[model samples]
Target: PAQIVLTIPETEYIYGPLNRSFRKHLPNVPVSRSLPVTIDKLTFHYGDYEQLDMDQLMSNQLYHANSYIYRKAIIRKHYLSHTIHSYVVKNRESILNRAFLESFNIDVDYAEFLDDALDENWELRQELESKEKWWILKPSMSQGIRIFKTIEQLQAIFDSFEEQLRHFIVQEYLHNPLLLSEAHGRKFHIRCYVTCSGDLQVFVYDRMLALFAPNKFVPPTEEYDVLDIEQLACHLTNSVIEFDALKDIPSHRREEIRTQIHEAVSELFKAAVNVDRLNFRPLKNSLETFGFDFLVDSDYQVKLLEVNAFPDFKQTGDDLKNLIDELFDDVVSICVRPMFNLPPLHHQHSKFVEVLKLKS
Candidate 1:
């Protein structure tokens, strides 16, 4: 029997469902929110890493540790927002490098750092008009993100932030993205799940999601400004704006998109493992699932947009809750069971429709 303890505070929403699921499925395994110093198994829910003392945790010999803080400590490195942004930008130069990224159609260009020195502002101004380009401004630590269409708008945004301008990255906006259906259609992004264990072995789950924009995907016109809150379709597909939008898409089309995305992600991660930008290291006895966002173009090319270390289950909706819950169970099966010499509770082929194990 395995005993699992959660380091997350009891008040968090994830605390309830996770504890309930483990108790229901693995009833023998004592699952509690209490964090005992010498617990045999320890798992951290989202925000759990930020609430602990890293120094004390590093000194333990727990059978399992599943927290971002623990992983970062063991690997001696961590991936930051800037690191991820740089990787996407560098991948844009595939034509020059002719590396693994060249084979895949997943490439995005990032905005240049706004600077008065070396005439960067002048260069940006020229590109804005010539390209009719759009740019996205992302403040390092939340405070919300915004999209700008004009050089004036960019300056206005910067002026509002004042001295905090250094904390943002302006990236080239992806244009003419693929729309789900015609006129008044919606722009969408895919969310895929991945789990990893021991020294570079990573697995991508088969079932995934395709989240859509809140409004219809309409191109900017003289009558309608792109930045208008009404035109959310041109922006990001966040659950806050549009939840469970994928459920409305036809199942067959969803399946097609899933297959296409999985292939691209597999190739993308494979490339990432080789590239200098992505330094992914598997820990000794841990299982972590990551949520990745991707956008596909009209030409059916998939672009890797972002990665989340902790995938939130709250947004999955009731229809998907069970499937996702079972997915988490399987994560523990593959990443945790082996360390304790316990057989996996579920058959991999039966539970996981598709599973890719990428190893270095």
Candidate 2:
């Protein structure tokens, strides 16, 4: 094989997995973890997007797309939520619209950046008043996620805010989630990896992690039976005290969720790329992987919850880190090898299922 280089951060969760994959599968390519890149060889970069030199991006380079180019359109809470919510608002006769509304009868999930709730959109408000719960999007990224039953409960988050608001999404809370019978009604979200490669083709990686909440669950109502910080664990599906490889539910239902995930991701890309091209420009010789989270509601409909760029591969946990190794192997197979006119590795078959494609 000809000379080629792989660039990765010296210390990162992905560094080990990346190194092992290239060494085991593409042994000819030299992996470099230091700076001052040797530009003579074809280089495949997998590190912080900000540090990447733009001139290098124009050369014989293969890289993950920068967050600025596609993350806002796909992962930002405000952008993606609105992108898909409004996307469903405009179109019909598509799985995206059907799956979204069928998830739990939504008029639409809206955002309120300003102070005044003004009972701004009463349709959703009145319905929540009569039933269901409300949750905020911003704080969950850091502070913590809590679920409350009324507009007043949700408003305190907005009312108590100190920082300048870029924006956050306010959506119907999943009060009723499919519980793990074995975990004693603990809630979880399925973390999945999906990649989009050159020009524009998207694929879903089959292996996934089902991250469970730290505590067991009950409802927020006395009538329903639980509330407070103790209940917060169930409301947010992070900091897993325990997690499985997913599919505690029946295999058929697991497949159903997977199907819904594919449709949701497909339409999400459409909303971000097809409807608004400027924000989601896909560069040539690049590949991007999004960490998508999905929640299965009581009715068994799979709802797309979040999209993450530069995903924390460590969250797969040390016990399951091999999953991340496999992911990079497939991404390099599907995205990097082609850039060098190399065919798929004879032994390592890629498990990515193509979910979207666009014409040049």
Candidate 3:
């Protein structure tokens, strides 16, 4: 009667905690690594969406396609570049609470590197003329960084790339990010988890991580290329700092940061839920976890840097491994248990902070 089988890929341990939680919380249910042979068994595939190469007992609900809609809409970098395009070019306006309009995406839009037509490049020259600030240039897709303050500098950088690498998503960079005194001016970003479940229940996991830049923060001087050995260490928060240091940040400062993160994430899903169902409407019985990265300004205002679908939880490493375990455990409490009409455990409380939900 409604037996469920959950599968985790043998190639990766991204779902190890999720797998363990299934075993711990729903001991009676079956969890397996074998490729499901589905004539009729309702197997849940919990890893990559691609692995759902079988029958449609729930049609990617376990590996939900709805989540992928949001994934492409904002999670994957390039598609996000396009979304920014919509909000900027007039006519079509999204009514969602796209807080990023005021935050990190302050000046985001794309332009072709070689096909520099439409005079947007001239407008970029205008922006260069208007401010002494900088803009980061990103490939439509990449796991890295490139920044330039002047249009001429950008042209030189563009010449360095081949044709396929021509398209770019240019974003105005906040040259002055909040630097932690405890961290001796090292820069950082908050890495938090958001779990969206079935037709949209958004849960923002509370044990947010403060990933730090490995080096001291410094303003751009003449040799201002973004990635000297020291520069990457200064600009990239892809590295980590102790979670305790973040906790120890003056509680007043701490509370504001947490509050902003909640507001930002809440606005994010509210925006997500309102989008075209084809772009990102949730599906019944579908669920997914998002890893959100946020940057802080000097005033403690948290800005959404990017959204990650299937974020690398392993980045927490041994020092903070419990964060992932508890996150997965909470995912079980909210995302998994609800799928089968199972109620929450009696004595335990969910570790996530409910951000927002779409009644529809």
Candidate 4:
């Protein structure tokens, strides 16, 4: 019934404008300035939500203690230095990747986005002319960044890559695959939250995915299967395929779809765990708490998509309350008693002062 609530100390109290007492003592650092402040040599493992004091954070907007802690652990993994593991992190973009690896009889689907067409000077026209599969352009750096419906829309963004190109990744669109049922006419996706630490934490946080009906699903054709945004406005899944389905789609149909979503995400997490073992090839050291994303094909076969060091748990459902509580408890413990803790502080701890010249 109780969930582990994370505290944003500095952000909520000290960093806020109302904390005058803290400001009085500090005479040099401009605490009023927003964001991008470098931490003074105190290396911290991200995701240790409880251990992080809100008053000490750089900026609440760009940094999250819990998520960062999780990410740091991942980057410090033993095999993380391996070229293949690094390759997997670089190529993490989709469910049905070009090449897949398996471990313990589970499929580890790692997608490689770098291609001749995706090269620095790769021409869109040339790539499209010889295009073999439908592709989805999902940029990196930010999640839920933007969705481009057509190649022309994709081109519009790609053309602007001259300034910021390294921040994007291309994925293959799911045309068709296996199916669980054609019960609903709409398309849908599920957003799941999983924490594979000391304990197995997996559950469906929400079934916020859907596409419209009457056009969402494509018929099983002898030649090929197709899915469109208009057709998927009703189904409801994790994929942002359907933006407005609950309003238009029937309630009964939505509930049935929700059931499928729960099952699907569970399977996805299992697949992700297998993928991690195979991809990382970790034997002695096992890092905990990885956020996984999966895409279920029309045929109902769930495919491994990608892994996130710092998965967003903000939108997760109430069903995850217990898991969150357990996770935060362990996270706090790890942070306080880490295998390797931060060393002695190296910088001056001057109080915040509007303006002051250095005393030489």
Candidate 5:
């Protein structure tokens, strides 16, 4: 069996807890902070891949042979971009979107990519009145700053951008979202955790978390005016907005929805990988986990919203944190044992349900 090395810095959120968990669980396995030019057998990295020279890393025999490296670049920014989704499904082209409409039936609303917002002429009032819709302006893959605005309000903002019309994705707002009126009538979304192992194998964790907006849900109407970005609880359900404001679904409901979501994710990925194997292929010697954001409509239909590669594990409370510790323990045990041809860890219990597998 190859020795294990960890290069993840202490500054990361999961650094202390996960490291402590690993030490306690796998006391025999050696773990360290630094990697030499000739890297060890197995390495777990939790930082940007751009910092390392890939060509050099690949060329070294210490790296290629008996080495399992978890690289961060597997999850691309464009993977979650609305613009790419538009290209994939051909926005407004029902025939293209129909492929998934039958099985999963998941769909995103229309969106426009603002490459050069200033180049196009705009009739602010007419566009706003005709559409009768709000917009969400996202700065590509970046976080923190999301704008919820009306057409005229966005037009004003765009005019300010003038010369710098960089990559921004503007999507039609999801006005009708599932809400828990009893819980302050706040809007909420699900954060499902997905773990991926060697080449296309995916697992959906059983215990997914829900995020809530601090404010109550207010339906948009013709009489109602521009969106107030300050009323964040109405639109955004992210840690940035309010980390503590959250609620978990009932255990039975959670299990049922987990089953459905697992199946849907499997079906969706199966179709996607079949269409383009390379793009969806999980690397042979790497393991990665992702946080997938999903929204449930008023009809109780789940919609795929976005994917975040580095999910924040810092906010989960003591109870959930204990579970996360167990989750990581299982992840390491399951993923690393095969590489060394070692027997599976004994009496292991996990909440992760297999979604898809490229290899046995």
Candidate 6:
């Protein structure tokens, strides 16, 4: 049976003058609603104790090479292993920032924006142009936005989308001078997911490739060919360009190509580990996550295509579970402390409020 209640109180202070007879009530107000108040308190308590502690613990533990954030300025400014020892790390970007942060006798990693910041604009352009014609241009934000294969397309982006000019990065071409092939003669590359907190973590890897081939022209006798993915390091698959090349290669050779690609990943992971460590240093404030996009060239050098901060959690699977959980726990902890002025849990004491119900 449904529950029912009735109430009456001399204390009930009705404020409005309700005269339905005087005028059929002026045009009505849009009905208002509130989220369940119970959940509000739960959210408040979670943040109060749990979230804040986790955030602070990680902050003092995880290290970014060069960080632009001011609140955590101590990270790059001047501090000693005094705040905490485990947080310090060798980061590529924070090499400079870390030195600046060590006023307190601490050794923290800082990253250099390119080789020089004053030569900043010049350094960036030189690096971008350093690569050959066919390469990938990535923005810190856009992941899976569009794939530009030629310099012309990149130029079109700069010319047409001027606003995005400062926001993007360019990477060198991944020449598979080997032309490794995979199952069904389809060319593919391996995509690996890696993460860093205090320790390095390898989450998952999947073979990625373009579905269609752009053309029939293959690299002459001395260029790169695609490879099949490997277990750990050389796991990248081909993009659209390499997949097309597979159509013409001898079917029997595909197995041989896959093997070579896997072999490359094993070797490349060593270099990749170094780069990942260096890249982990924070650049933007509030930076807490990463999605590293990598590729290997014919020489087997692991070329970094991009580093993503807000990597999509859904797409990454169990590889990201612990990181995500820790991040959330930290958030919840931060919320509970009185230092942070969070919203109220209950609205009952608002200047004045009343509960209304039809009586039987």
In model 1, the runs with Cα more than 4 Å from the true position are 9-17, 24-28, 39-47, 51-61, 68-168, 181-184, 221-256, 267-278, 346-360
Clash count of each predicted structure: 2, 1, 0, 43, 2, 59
Tens-digit lDDT track for model 2 on 1-360?
334344555567777776776676666776655544355545565657666565656544543333335457667655665566566667776666544421121221233543234355444455456744444333322234445556566555444444332334345567778887776778877788888887788889877777777678666652332245434565477544222344467777777877888888888777777654335767676777888888768777876777888787765456567677778878777666666677755444445788899886
**Tens digits of lDDT, candidate 3, 130-183:** 656667765554323567777667666565543343345666677768877678
Give candidate 2's TM-score. Answer: 0.74
Tens digits of per-residue lDDT for model 6, 1-360: 111011212222210111111112111211112222222121111111112333333343221111112222122212212221222234344222221111111111122232332143453344345543344444434222233444345454444433322344343344353334443333233333332221222112222222233232254221222211122133234223322235544544543433343333332222233342232222211223234344434443333333343344332334243334433332222211111233212323221111111121
Colliding pairs, model 5:
199-282, 200-282
Q: How well is each residue in 1-360 modelled by candidate 1, as lDDT tens digits? A: 456667676766566666765665555666655555654454432235454444444554454555433333112212333233345465664321211111101111222333342144343455455645566655543334566777667655555545422445455566667765532477877677766655445666665676767777666543433344533444455533222244545566555655665555454444444445444444454556677676766654556566676666565467566557666666666565555565656673644433346544
- Highest lDDT, which number? 2
Ranking by TM-score: 2, 3, 5, 1, 4, 6
Which residue window of length 10 is worst by lDDT in model 5?
99-108
Clashes of 5: 2
Predicted candidate 4 versus true structure: per-residue lDDT over 242-351, tens digit per residue = 21234543465445444554444443333333444433222111223445344545444443344455444442344343334434433333321222232212224311
Query: Model-by-model lDDT, in order?
Result: 0.52, 0.62, 0.60, 0.35, 0.52, 0.28
> What TM-score against the true fold does each predicted structure earn?
0.63, 0.74, 0.74, 0.34, 0.66, 0.28
Can you give the lDDT of residue 98 in candidate 3?
A: 31
**lDDT at 140 for candidate 5?**
47
By TM-score, the better pick of 3 and 6 is 3
Better of 4 and 6 by lDDT: 4
Best by TM-score: 2
